[PDB]
Amino acid sequence: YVEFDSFWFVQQWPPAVCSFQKSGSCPGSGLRTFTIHGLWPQQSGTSLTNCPGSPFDITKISHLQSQLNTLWPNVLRANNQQFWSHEWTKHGTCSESTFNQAAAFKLAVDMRNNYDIIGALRPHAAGPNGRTKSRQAIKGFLKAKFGKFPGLRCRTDPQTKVSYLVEVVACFAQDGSTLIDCTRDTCGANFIF
Numbered sequence: 001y002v003e004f005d006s007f008w009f010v011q012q013w014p015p016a017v018c019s020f021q022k023s024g025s026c027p028g029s030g031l032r033t034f035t036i037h038g039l040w041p042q043q044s045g046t047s048l049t050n051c052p053g054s055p056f057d058i059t060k061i062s063h064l065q066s067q068l069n070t071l072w073p074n075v076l077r078a079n080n081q082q083f084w085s086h087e088w089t090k091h092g093t094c095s096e097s098t099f100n101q102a103a104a105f106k107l108a109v110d111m112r113n114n115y116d117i118i119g120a121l122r123p124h125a126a127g128p129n130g131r132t133k134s135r136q137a138i139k140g141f142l143k144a145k146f147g148k149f150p151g152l153r154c155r156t157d158p159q160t161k162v163s164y165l166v167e168v169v170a171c172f173a174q175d176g177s178t179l180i181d182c183t184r185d186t187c188g189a190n191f192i193f
């Protein structure tokens with residue numbers, strides 16, 4: 001069996017994520033704050049997925065639904081539970097040996113409350129404005145605020161080839177509490193944000 005050695009706390013930028021879904025409606029299109037995508041256990045540089053764990057049980061986190069509906073909405077479809085269930089089954093099960101479902105979602109909520117990206121960039125006016133930003137600059141501002149380098153993830157429009165920031169990753173040690181440096185970015189030196 002495999003033992004995760006770290007976590008990737010992944011937050012997503014709703015507007016960008018929605019823009020890549022040019023086919024249909026997008027519930028979170030109007031959100032202007034980073035929301036939780038998921039907490040992904042890592043192993044030797046790779047995300048551990050689909051581990052032999054417990055079925056998702058909404059009643060196990062019923063007490064967090066309040067916070068989850070605000071910080072962890074399904075931005076693509078109007079079904080938050082489906083999104084939480086998927087993230088648990090695909091990612092959460094892989095760290096269940098230490099964190100049961102209730103503990104994992106609570107961990108994600110706490111991490112989100114301790115990692116306000118927009119708030120951290122505002123003092124530098126480095127927030128979203130649909131213009132080009134520097135990977136180095138953004139990583140620098142976040143490290144100065146939180147203490148460690150985040151991971152920046154981008155997606156490229158197939159038509160225009162323009163790169164857009166879509167997710168920001170905060171890396172944690174196996175304890176799920178000690179912030180550590182992220183080392184992998186999918187974003188190039190510059191991107192739209």
Ligand SMILES: O=c1ccn([C@@H]2O[C@H](COP(=O)(O)O)[C@@H](O)[C@H]2O)c(=O)[nH]1
Pocket residue numbers: 017037038073074075076077083086087090091
């Ligand atoms: O707000 C969101 C963001 C992503 N996804 C979905 O989750 C998957 C991406 O997450 P992952 O499987 O890599 O954890 C995709 O199928 C995507 O449609 C949602 O349902 N809602």
